[PDB]
């Protein structure tokens, strides 16, 4: 249940974790390092953006494009009509790329884990994060 209160909490904590400037790369690195560690085959999906070297300028630009799109969706969590249109466009950037369905719940788990690591686990609301993140990826995959 990504409730109206849940959405505001997620927006607040996401902005805190994502941050400004290079702090966004700190969050991105936590996400990709975790994802690639858990799902080794996922790295190959990024061969065109140098997924073999996540510290390269090429992969970092990719990483920030991805977190930028997640940021854009999170920011619009309390504006569903616009969010649905954003998700629809993001879906066009992923369909027919052969991305394994499993990659999405894995990315969700890595993103949530990275935010939690950044803002602190005490009192962290996993139901709000999982339910809202799921609403976002469910519009992107398939």
């Amino acid at each position: 249940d990504c409730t109206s209160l849940n959405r505001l909490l997620v927006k607040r904590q996401w902005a805190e974790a994502y941050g400004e400037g290079t702090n966004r790369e700190l969050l991105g690195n936590r996400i990709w390092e975790d994802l690639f560690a858990n799902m080794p085959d996922a790295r190959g999906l990024f061969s065109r953006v140098n997924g073999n070297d996540i510290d390269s300028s090429e992969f970092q630009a990719h990483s920030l494009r991805v977190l930028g799109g997640l940021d854009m969706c999170v920011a619009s969590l309390d504006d569903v009509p616009v969010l649905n249109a954003l998700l629809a466009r993001l879906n066009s950037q992923h369909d027919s790329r052969g991305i394994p369905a499993a990659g999405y719940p894995a990315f969700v788990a890595s993103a949530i884990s990275a935010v939690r690591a950044t803002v602190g686990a005490r009192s962290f609301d996993n139901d709000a994060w999982n339910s809202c993140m799921n609403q976002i990826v469910s519009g992107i995959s398939g």
Binding site: Y18, T22, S57, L64, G68, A75, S76, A85, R89
Partner: protein, 147 residues
């Protein structure tokens, strides 16, 4: 050309993020819609390039998302100003995307610059036009390269 100095980008990044942060609600759409309203007001022909996003019904979910998507693109670039090696890869990316859109010309970025220059002063509590102009050009010139 002008130069987007270390001080310029620090100022621009801070003030921009204070307005665009995902923490707030309803500010992104208002700001992005105002930028596009200004753009179309300045260059009547410009709207034509945005036929695929329902530009004639500004309050549609589709147009609003378009405005927000484009402007978040600027957010992404502005926040890469403290890691230009990455910004350069990103601008190249953005450049190739625009080169692939029939009609998009370099002159359009000047009108877009104009639109942001008109809108930012109205919504950013603390705003410095010269720093903005110089850092926006550093970014825009990277995207419009090629067109």
């Amino acid at each position: 050309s002008s130069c987007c100095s270390s001080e310029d980008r620090a100022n621009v990044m801070h003030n921009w993020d204070a307005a665009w942060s995902a923490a707030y609600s309803d500010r992104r759409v208002a700001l992005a819609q105002a930028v596009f309203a200004s753009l179309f007001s300045r260059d009547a022909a410009a709207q034509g390039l945005f036929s695929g996003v329902s530009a004639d019904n500004p309050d549609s979910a589709d147009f609003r998302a378009h405005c927000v998507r484009v402007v978040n693109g600027l957010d992404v670039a502005i926040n890469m100003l403290n890691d230009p090696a990455v910004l350069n890869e990103q601008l190249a990316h953005l450049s190739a995307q625009h080169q692939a859109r029939a009609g998009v010309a370099a002159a359009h970025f000047d009108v877009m610059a104009e639109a942001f220059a008109e809108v930012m002063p109205q919504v950013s509590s603390c705003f410095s036009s010269d720093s903005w102009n110089r850092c926006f050009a550093r970014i825009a010139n990277g995207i419009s390269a090629g067109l």
